[PDB]
């Protein structure tokens, strides 16, 4: 017959191998598929979905409905931020649990832009200004409203538009970051003006926060760390 | 019908679809799907069941599928001393649309 020469790698089973294989049911007429709504062709389609950030992971707030709400109140006008969110989507406990983070935990490398979307859930009457800042990687996060204003920022008007979609850029020395450890930036929200309200309307509102990958986002080198 | 050429009457051949609890009275059966078979005129009655299933295929073991059921519409009339005890036979067959799959031989000793 055809003289062959069995090479190294013969009779080994590599779990990453991709060969043909004999069908155990070769005469069996498979149930044909139907057009179900919602076919996912890629996992990033699930990371491109605005999911809600848990900001308060304290002992009480966590694992409830309150861990997501950031409460704006009326107290002494301290320059410190309402929230400061580090942009370690995998190595930040807050973004780690989002859908994005759940998909990033399955991978080693990632690259792309994130879009954060804060959402005022207060009154139609209430008015005011927040300042949504973005410190780039390497920078030590802004501690006062002035430091934040001078850098990149968006003066969000609570009175006019009820959301604010700031998009982070892709800044990294490598073509890809890691999902574990080291910076990546900081979103941070300050009061520009203490929130005004009309009559006996409550002076304690809430802002929600969403995150999602952008169309430029990509991951690689699958790494499942799931076990018991 | 394997009775007399003389005998006359009406049977009602009903088909309850799957999920339905079978008809217990002639009225309940008539209101649903049915065929008033005339014993006097035509000696057979070919009712075809349809293919109703949630899946594209049923199982051969366990859960419904319907009920054929035959009632008297009229007690069978006969002429003179002709016997008043007739017989009906019943046949079944797949149709051209029938198909099976996933062979499962359970034959053993």
């Amino acid at each position: 017959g055809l003289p062959v020469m069995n090479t190294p790698g013969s009779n080994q089973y590599l779990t990453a191998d991709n060969f043909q294989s004999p069908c155990a049911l070769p005469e069996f007429d498979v149930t044909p598929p139907i057009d179900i709504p919602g076919e996912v062709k890629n996992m990033m389609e699930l990371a491109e979905i605005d999911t809600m950030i848990p900001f308060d992971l304290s002992a009480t707030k966590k694992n409830t409905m309150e861990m997501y709400r950031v409460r704006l109140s009326d107290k002494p006008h301290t320059d410190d931020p309402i929230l400061c969110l580090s942009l370690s989507p995998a190595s930040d406990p807050r973004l780690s649990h989002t859908m994005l983070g759940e998909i990033l935990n399955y991978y080693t490398h990632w690259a792309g832009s994130l879009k954060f979307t804060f959402l005022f859930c207060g009154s139609m009457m209430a008015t005011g200004k927040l300042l949504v800042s973005y410190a780039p990687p390497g920078a030590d996060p802004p501690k006062k409203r002035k430091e934040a204003m001078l850098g990149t920022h968006v003066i969000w008007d609570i009175g006019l538009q009820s959301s604010c979609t700031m998009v982070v850029p892709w800044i990294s020395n490598t073509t890809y970051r890691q999902t574990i450890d080291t910076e990546g930036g900081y979103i941070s929200v300050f009061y520009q003006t203490r929130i005004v309200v009309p009559l006996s309307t409550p002076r304690e509102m809430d802002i929600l926060g969403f995150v999602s990958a952008c169309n430029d986002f990509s991951v690689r080198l699958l790494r499942d760390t799931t076990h018991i | 019908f394997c009775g007399s050429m003389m005998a006359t009457g009406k049977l009602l051949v009903s088909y309850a679809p799957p999920g339905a609890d079978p008809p217990k009275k002639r009225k309940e059966a008539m209101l649903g799907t049915h065929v008033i078979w005339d014993i006097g005129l035509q000696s057979s009655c070919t009712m075809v069941v349809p293919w109703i299933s949630n899946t594209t295929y049923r199982q051969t073991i366990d859960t419904e599928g319907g009920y054929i059921s035959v009632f008297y519409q009229t007690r069978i009339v006969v002429p003179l001393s002709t016997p008043r005890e007739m017989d009906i036979l019943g046949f079944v067959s797949a149709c051209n649309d029938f198909s099976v799959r996933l062979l499962r031989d359970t034959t053993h000793i």
């Binding site: 005469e27 069996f28 007429d29 | 649309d97 198909s99 099976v100 799959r101 996933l102 062979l103």
Partner: peptide, 7 residues
């Protein structure tokens, strides 16, 4: 409809 496995 398919009658291959009953061939």
């Amino acid at each position: 409809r398919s009658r291959s496995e009953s061939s």
